[PDB]
Amino acid sequence: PPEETLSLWKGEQARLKARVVDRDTEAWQRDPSFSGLQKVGGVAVSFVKGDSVRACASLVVLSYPELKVVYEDSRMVGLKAPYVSGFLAFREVPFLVELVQRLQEKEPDLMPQVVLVDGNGVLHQRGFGVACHLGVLTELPCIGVAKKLLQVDGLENNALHKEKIVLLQAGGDTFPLIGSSGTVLGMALRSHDHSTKPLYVSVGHRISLEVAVRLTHHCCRFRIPEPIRQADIRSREYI
């Protein structure tokens, strides 16, 4: 009953968006060296077309500060119709929740304290990206780490944007992503000395933007934050 389904999802999008928290809720987040942080998660998803859409997803957990994989669960499943633009997350995210639930059941001591999501946070067409959606359904702190600048609220990959990227001279350097509204939606981060291409970081849930950006940088042994890099490898394996 697709009209019923999409209508339900539209209501849920509004309700879930209102649940997004953009401040820190954990003691470890307020410590300058993130004292108390031991486990960082990574999530990545790739889709495949077919009679049914398939999703290849990976949840990994890494030790922190060491960034070594301590848990992994990577899967390919079919997702159920209806497939509606702007609402694929309403099939995708419950599958990701299932991964988290399986971790809680099978290895509860390895539950991540924060999840780095390969995808968008509040820097999103409707201010409710996959990282927000996963966060509110699990109550886990989540960060949206995007590889491209999302064109919302007047953000443009224009000449000035490109100039600001050049002026990111070293790993850790940032510049704010500020909408036409004047709202700070996220930060561009040069994640590593080796790469000149920035990551675009925004809050998913239960973390502040400053903390999200600093933690993201600290997870970058290479350009892509290690939990995402590891999840990416495993969700391309299934592709």
Author numbering: 9 to 247
The authors write:
Removal of inosines from genomic DNA is dealt with by the base excision repair pathway as well as endonuclease V (EndoV), which is considered the major player. Our data show that mEndoV shares substrate preferences with hEndoV by catalyzing cleavage at inosines in RNA and being inert towards inosines in DNA. The structure determination of mEndoV revealed a protein fold which is to a large extent similar to human and prokaryotic EndoVs.
The region around residues 167–174 contains a mammalian specific α-helix similar to that of hEndoV. The structure of mouse EndoV reveals a new conformation of the highly conserved strand-separating wedge motif. The invariant Tyr residue, normally pointing into the DNA/RNA binding groove and stacking with the DNA/RNA substrate during catalysis, is facing away from the groove. For this reason, the DNA/RNA binding groove in the crystal structure of mouse EndoV in the unbound state is wide and shallow. In contrast to all other reported EndoV structures, the invariant Tyr91 in mEndoV is interacting with the backbone of the protein through hydrogen bonds to Ser60, Val61 and Leu87. In order to stack with nucleotides in the active site pocket, the mEndoV Tyr91 must undergo a transition to the trans side chain conformation for χ1. The MD simulation suggests that the wedge motif has some flexibility and that the invariant Tyr might flip between two conformations, of which a probably unbound or unproductive state is shown in the structure of mEndoV. The corresponding region in mEndoV is 225-HHCC-228, and our structure of mEndoV reveals that the first two Cys residues in hEndoV are replaced by histidines with no change in the local geometry. The latter two Cys residues are conserved between mouse and human EndoV, and with similar conformations and local environment in the two structures.
